[PDB]
């Protein structure tokens, strides 16, 4: 378990190992955060939230 496979590698969504080391992204409507790890939605309904309200 190195990059990627350990823990995903910190990433919220998308992991990638691009040229070693970790780079993560997000699906559409949200926003890779300020640590370049978390995903902020983007809206209201973000897509793979389960409705709260």
Same mark, same amino acid.
């Given at each position: 378990?190195? =990059?990627? $496979?350990?823990? @995903?590698?910190?990433?919220? +969504?998308?992991?990638?190992?691009? +040229? @070693? $080391?970790?780079? %993560? $992204?997000?699906?559409?409507?949200?926003? =890779?955060?300020? @640590? *370049?790890?978390? %995903?902020?939605?983007?809206?209201?309904?973000?897509? *793979?939230? +389960?409705?709260?309200?």
């Amino acid at each position: 378990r190195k =990059l990627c $496979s350990l823990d @995903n590698g910190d990433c919220d +969504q998308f992991c990638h190992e691009e +040229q @070693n $080391s970790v780079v %993560c $992204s997000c699906a559409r409507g949200y926003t =890779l955060a300020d @640590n *370049g790890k978390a %995903c902020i939605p983007t809206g209201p309904y973000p897509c *793979g939230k +389960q409705t709260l309200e």
